[PDB]
Amino acid sequence: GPISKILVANRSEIAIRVFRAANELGIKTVAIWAEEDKLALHRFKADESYQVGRGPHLRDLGPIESYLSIDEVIRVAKLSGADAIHPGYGLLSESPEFVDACNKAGIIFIGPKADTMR
């Protein structure tokens, strides 16, 4: 099945840049946000958004730490039903461990394969 819901594992302008492309393609979008990003516009630009890094399921992760949590990102991808993740740039975009976790969850990693990265 072609990609129909993308979670952007990122924030700020790159997350918005990817939401725009996805929406233009008719693809659903999912944002993530740390508590510190509760007012960040990228989260209001996706079709739905979910907090990462805080809660009963943890300590509170730091502002940037929340976005580097492979476990949190995968949790929200499953929760939202995202079938692909775009890592944008920076953050987890060159983590083979992250690509591996995506592969394990059956979620498409939008970028090169894990072995390519290593």
Add this chain to the structure above:
Amino acid sequence: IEKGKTLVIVNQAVSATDSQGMVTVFFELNGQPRRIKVPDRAHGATGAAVRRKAEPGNAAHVGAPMPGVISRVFVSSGQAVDVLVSIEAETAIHAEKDGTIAEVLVKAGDQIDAKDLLAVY
């Protein structure tokens, strides 16, 4: 409001009751200012929203082009195409057509906002 649609709401400020019996709550909603007016029912303002309110359509309605306080009313029953009221911020609001005005909702040394209904033909 639904799953994945979380609003962040902050109470920034609450105004004094205004001359219309309305209190403005200045909210921040998802980071953006939103002003919401409600009647001050607590202080006896049930029956309140007060000032109409011009319809951009009709001809009929004399709507304020701008916010201010009215400085002079020049009319209360009909003529020409003539200064009807002035607004200080003085302008100088003219009748757009021939007619008989059948209502003057001002008033004034009254404060008004653009689109408030000033007079009706």
Add this chain to the structure above:
Amino acid sequence: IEKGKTLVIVNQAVSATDSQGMVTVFFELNGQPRRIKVPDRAHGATGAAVRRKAEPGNAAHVGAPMPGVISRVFVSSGQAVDVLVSIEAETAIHAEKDGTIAEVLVKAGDQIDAKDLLAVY
């Protein structure tokens, strides 16, 4: 007020607007306290004095025997000679006659004063 009749007037206190849209100015007049209520027209309370007001005459009128807040309303259209409302300060105001009540001016968790009109037969 006339030659040899000099009043001494002091503004002692001005209340917040109350639930009826009225402000109380507590004056001292010739050394004696006098409370005077006016509408808070400045905040949109033109149309205000609000609560009637029982006539000691008629039968007809259910007037509050005492000041308080109403705690329960037990009625809105007619019976017996029965608790109509209660007032907390709970009392316990009874119907004095047989009838059908045709108005309940309360209401309440409303504050009232002795003589306020509670209900009309």
